[PDB]
Structure formats: structure tokens, C-alpha cells
Motif scaffolding. Structure first.
Motif, PDB file in Angstrom:
ATOM      1  N   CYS A  16     -13.550 -44.159   3.280  1.00 16.99           N
ATOM      2  CA  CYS A  16     -12.520 -44.126   4.225  1.00 16.99           C
ATOM      3  C   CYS A  16     -11.667 -42.884   4.043  1.00 16.99           C
ATOM      4  N   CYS A  17     -11.296 -42.242   5.154  1.00 21.31           N
ATOM      5  CA  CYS A  17     -10.416 -41.069   5.038  1.00 21.31           C
ATOM      6  C   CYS A  17      -8.989 -41.570   4.697  1.00 21.31           C
ATOM      7  N   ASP A  18      -8.300 -40.843   3.821  1.00 22.27           N
ATOM      8  CA  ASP A  18      -6.887 -41.184   3.515  1.00 22.27           C
ATOM      9  C   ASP A  18      -5.866 -40.703   4.530  1.00 22.27           C
ATOM     10  N   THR A  19      -6.203 -39.719   5.347  1.00 20.25           N
ATOM     11  CA  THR A  19      -5.262 -39.147   6.250  1.00 20.25           C
ATOM     12  C   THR A  19      -5.531 -39.394   7.665  1.00 20.25           C
ATOM     13  N   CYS A  20      -6.618 -40.110   7.972  1.00 19.32           N
ATOM     14  CA  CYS A  20      -6.915 -40.544   9.336  1.00 19.32           C
ATOM     15  C   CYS A  20      -7.731 -41.832   9.228  1.00 19.32           C
ATOM     16  N   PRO A  21      -7.907 -42.533  10.357  1.00 15.51           N
ATOM     17  CA  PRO A  21      -8.595 -43.812  10.304  1.00 15.51           C
ATOM     18  C   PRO A  21     -10.119 -43.741  10.346  1.00 15.51           C
ATOM     19  N   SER A  41      -9.619 -36.439   2.048  1.00 17.23           N
ATOM     20  CA  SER A  41      -9.428 -36.161   3.454  1.00 17.23           C
ATOM     21  C   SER A  41     -10.857 -35.689   4.004  1.00 17.23           C
ATOM     22  N   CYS A  42     -11.234 -36.366   5.085  1.00 18.76           N
ATOM     23  CA  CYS A  42     -12.485 -36.041   5.871  1.00 18.76           C
ATOM     24  C   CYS A  42     -12.413 -34.597   6.462  1.00 18.76           C
ATOM     25  N   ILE A  43     -13.605 -34.154   6.900  1.00 16.02           N
ATOM     26  CA  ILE A  43     -13.779 -32.847   7.542  1.00 16.02           C
ATOM     27  C   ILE A  43     -12.917 -32.720   8.786  1.00 16.02           C
ATOM     28  N   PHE A  44     -12.685 -33.773   9.620  1.00 10.51           N
ATOM     29  CA  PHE A  44     -11.888 -33.712  10.764  1.00 10.51           C
ATOM     30  C   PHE A  44     -10.434 -33.304  10.375  1.00 10.51           C
ATOM     31  N   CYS A  45     -10.029 -33.891   9.258  1.00 14.71           N
ATOM     32  CA  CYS A  45      -8.660 -33.661   8.810  1.00 14.71           C
ATOM     33  C   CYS A  45      -8.536 -32.233   8.238  1.00 14.71           C
ATOM     34  N   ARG A  46      -9.534 -31.800   7.473  1.00 11.12           N
ATOM     35  CA  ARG A  46      -9.543 -30.460   6.883  1.00 11.12           C
ATOM     36  C   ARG A  46      -9.524 -29.400   7.972  1.00 11.12           C
TER      37      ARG A  46
HETATM   38 ZN    ZN Z   1      -9.703 -37.821   8.264  1.00 10.39          ZN
END
Ligand code: ZN
Ligand code: ZN
Ligand code: ZN
Length: 178
Positions: A16-21, A41-46
Motif C-alpha cells: 500500500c502507498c503511504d501517501t496515496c490510496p 511512496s508509489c511511483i505516482f507519488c514520486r
Molecule cells: Zn502513491
């Protein structure tokens, strides 16, 4: 967090990403979900962070300039994210693994290419410029169009190329044109 993988849309062993769902299978995320790292943090967040740190990075660019960029960490990440956006489409299954070519009236391509081969190449830092990654991605679809000729299956190559190209223009902030 979501209860399905963002990429393949299935349940299973999800990180699970920590900064998005969003959530991910280990090897559906690119790069593969990192061993430790709390928070993660996932690639989307990065990618959203790069943009936020440098808002001018969203101004239009010429494709020829983008292609010549060296594969420094931010460009490496952008190519990983672009690859992941192609895997997000279910029609990527046709292009994921190593193809073979035995059709009456066609000859296979001189340089076969496939998504998992591009994924390995990125992981192994084999590309020195964005151009290397983009040329291999476009080669996937070009090989497919040439081999399938007038079979209606050629349309799968057009479809998945369109997903690649739209995402390329978005991620690398290509100048909009008519
Ligand atoms: Zn994310
Ligand atoms: Zn998945
Ligand atoms: Zn800036």
C-alpha cells in the motif's frame, strides 16, 4: 487504500502507498516494491513530487530535446512510470512476453521486442538516453503492425501505441500541437 492492484486490477498480496490510496502487487509496481522503506511512496507519488518541486517542468517541450536527455534519476523514473502506464492497460498482455512468428505470408521482425524485455533493460540501467527507451517501446508496436499486415489483430498494436504516446506526451510535458 484500494483493495485491488492499480496496474492489473486484481486482489492478492498488495503493498500500500503511504501517501496515496493506491496499492500494488510487488512486481506490478515499477520499480518492484522496495523491501523496507517506511513510509513508502508509489511511483505516482514520486512523479507528482518532481512536478511540485519544479512547476516549470510542466511547460511544453520538444520531443527531440526530450529524447536526447541522459537517463539521470528523474528521467529513469519518468520512463519507469511511462512503462507502468502501458502495463495498466489490459491489452498490454499481448506485448508483455517474448513473441514468436509463424504465419503464412509474413516473416518475423529482424529485432523482436517486448515489454518485459524493456522492463529488464530499465532495471539493469541499459539505456543511457530517453531515446533508447522510446525507440524500443515504439519498436514493439511497429513490429506488430508489420507482421500482422491486414489481419484485424493489427489494431491491438495501434491501440496500445496510442496509450504509450498519450502518456509519453503527458509525462514528458510535450508541447501541445494541432
Ligand atoms: Zn502513491
Ligand atoms: Zn497487479
Ligand atoms: Zn524549478
Amino acid at each position: 487504500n484500494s483493495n485491488i492492484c492499480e496496474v492489473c486490477n486484481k486482489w492478492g498480496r498488495l503493498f500500500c502507498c503511504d501517501t496515496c490510496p493506491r496499492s500494488f502487487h510487488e512486481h506490478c509496481h515499477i520499480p518492484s516494491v522496495e523491501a523496507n522503506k517506511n513510509p513508502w511512496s508509489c511511483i505516482f507519488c514520486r512523479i507528482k513530487t518532481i512536478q511540485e518541486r519544479c512547476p516549470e517542468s510542466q511547460s511544453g517541450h520538444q520531443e527531440s530535446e526530450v529524447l536526447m536527455r541522459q537517463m539521470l534519476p528523474e528521467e529513469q523514473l519518468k520512463c519507469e512510470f511511462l512503462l507502468l502506464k502501458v502495463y495498466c492497460d489490459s491489452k498490454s498482455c499481448f506485448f508483455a512476453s517474448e513473441p514468436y512468428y509463424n504465419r503464412e505470408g509474413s516473416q518475423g521482425p529482424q529485432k523482436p521486442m517486448w515489454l518485459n524485455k524493456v522492463k529488464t533493460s530499465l532495471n539493469e540501467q541499459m539505456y543511457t538516453r530517453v531515446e533508447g527507451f522510446v525507440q524500443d517501446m515504439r519498436l514493439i508496436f511497429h513490429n506488430h503492425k508489420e507482421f500482422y499486415r491486414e489481419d484485424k489483430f493489427t489494431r491491438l498494436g495501434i491501440q496500445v501505441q496510442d496509450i504509450f504516446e498519450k502518456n509519453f506526451r503527458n509525462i514528458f510535458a510535450i508541447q501541445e500541437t494541432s
